[model samples]
Target: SSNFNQETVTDIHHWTDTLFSFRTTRDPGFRFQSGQFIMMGLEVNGKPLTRAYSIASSLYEDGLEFFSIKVPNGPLTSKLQHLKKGDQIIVSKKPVGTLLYDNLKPGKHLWLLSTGTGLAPFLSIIRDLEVYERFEKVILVHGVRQVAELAYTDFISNELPQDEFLGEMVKNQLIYYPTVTREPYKTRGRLTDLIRSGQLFKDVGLPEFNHEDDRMMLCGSPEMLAETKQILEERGFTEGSQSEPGEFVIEKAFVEK
Candidate 1:
């Protein structure tokens, strides 16, 4: 009787031992704006064991996709990590979050800063053609600890540029900047360090952060959010909200275990 929708797992891909992604059957009525998350999980001991997970697929897609990290002892993930095709999972009818495109004030560039599994919502945002319609440039910055942890590299680099609906806009407007801290990559170091040192802008060939022309969304660890938010604030960037759109918005990528 509640707002729960029972959906079946359709596909699963394990990127690494600690990371995996899954696709689920989405009910025709279960609609959501891009960049929103729904409450989803399994039933154990006659109880619903659920957690908030951001949607990784676009609104145009028929199925729902989610990216997740396998926390060995996490209450919900410990069970979710074992999901098999044809298994049933409960997804909430309602989707909610602060990272929506409408929450941001109009600007020249849309900066998506994420780390680890924080890339989930941004994946939704980038796939939607509406994003490219709004901003002249969309810069996606993903920071991870290792090369293996860099999920969806080929998808972001190759597939998006050739997407049927989003291909032309994506090729011209989207910029991918993947940075690795513990491994060797073209861009190396913490995103905050890169931003503070002005190297990120230089490498991306964009000017330094400015509130007037740059609208940003951040999804990452608490420390990353805190440090990045501080840097933006120091640069006179204002925060945005549902009621009043502003220069930037942020949501914690994942709740620490």
Candidate 2:
């Protein structure tokens, strides 16, 4: 079916009790823009079971990588979480999503806000050199329940700056702020509260989010989305799409089963 293609897992790593990431072989000519997602999964009991997942690797990076959480009894992740190296996985022939660069107007600062595994797409965006070129600074504010859930911290804050191609820019422009809501961490709160109370701005050393030159990309659960959107739209930020560019853009982490 043109809807599916098989890719082999080349590497896998479990980052937490319920969180993991994997790398797989890419089909020749397979390409995806930063912040795009694809449908992937497997056949179970003679039936195909799949789910849409955001790809976490940069477009310029070879192959594909995905970060996922083990949803208890989830239609897909329950099984997908156990995949190992050399295992064959199903990836869609075509990649699609609304979180790409075309959806946002050019801006001075790019804010990528996410919760839980919603961080996947933004991870791809921050890794792309094009994002740096499009904005003066890229700020990533991730909220997790516990500190252990804060994945990719070292990669973005430490390793990225030392990258041969992305180092200089990341060193100068990338700012990462991680908040823990349940556990004790330096910062603790929902991004919405932090944003509304001005703490997020004060901590990031920037003024509040303004539609003028600050653009944002939001990905989270339904509740998280509603509250976050309220803050943005209340202040005059208009949501955008690939066909209609605007100062802010949003996509749910994935459609729930």
Candidate 3:
């Protein structure tokens, strides 16, 4: 239809057998703020077959980036994983999501919690200089089944801090908490479990969750959202919306293997 734009795949990276990411050309007029998801995919049968994917690139970056899972025998990712540079993918001009900084009230600490490809939108938020400008402290807690699934560790730990203007803020205020579920690692457990045990806060040297001074964003599976959201609400955190800012916001990441 006339609603979507044809964007050329500019680059691609296969993180694992089932996981991959790619970058595509951005139309000059297709504007979006950081931490948003747009419906994008390849057209099949002469019609666009699309799915919601979080934008992984910074708003200031030149292109749009997305992280995805190769669904076995599934409609989109089954064929999407085979695409290469110069291939065209359908990218909807309309972008929207609840994970934006505008959805949360200003606070001293910002917590980003994610699992699997749920880490996508946070990738965009963490890359933006505006996030650092708004919060005094930012912590990212990512949970995965295996250590290899911890994508962008180097970029988050090394590149972000080394960035010219964003470097100072990241080096001084950012902390990353990576956890594993089915594999052994330095940190092993579900994020909800860690937060429940108080070990997560201990390791990061921050007091346990409080809505007043700490704002949060959650992106993961249904279970992760349900469990984490329950904990937050119990501790006085309220769910936020694009129309009304609150203490936290969430979006479910779809990547069923």
The predictions' CA RMSDs to the true structure, in order, are: 1.1, 1.4, 1.4
Q: For model 2, how does the per-residue alpha-carbon lDDT over 121-229 read when each residue is reduced to its tens digit? A: 9988888999988889898999988888898987877788898998899888988999999989999999998998899989999887777789999998877888998
lDDT of each: 0.90, 0.86, 0.90
Better of 1 and 2 by lDDT: 1
Pick the TM-score winner: 1
Worst 10 residues of 1 by lDDT: 248-257
Per-residue error at 30 for model 1, in Å?
1.0
TM-score of each: 0.97, 0.96, 0.96
In candidate 3, what are the lDDT values of residues 10-46, reduced to their tens digit? Answer: 9999888988889998888888887899999987888
Pairs with backbone N, CA or C atoms under 3 Å apart (clashes), candidate 1:
none
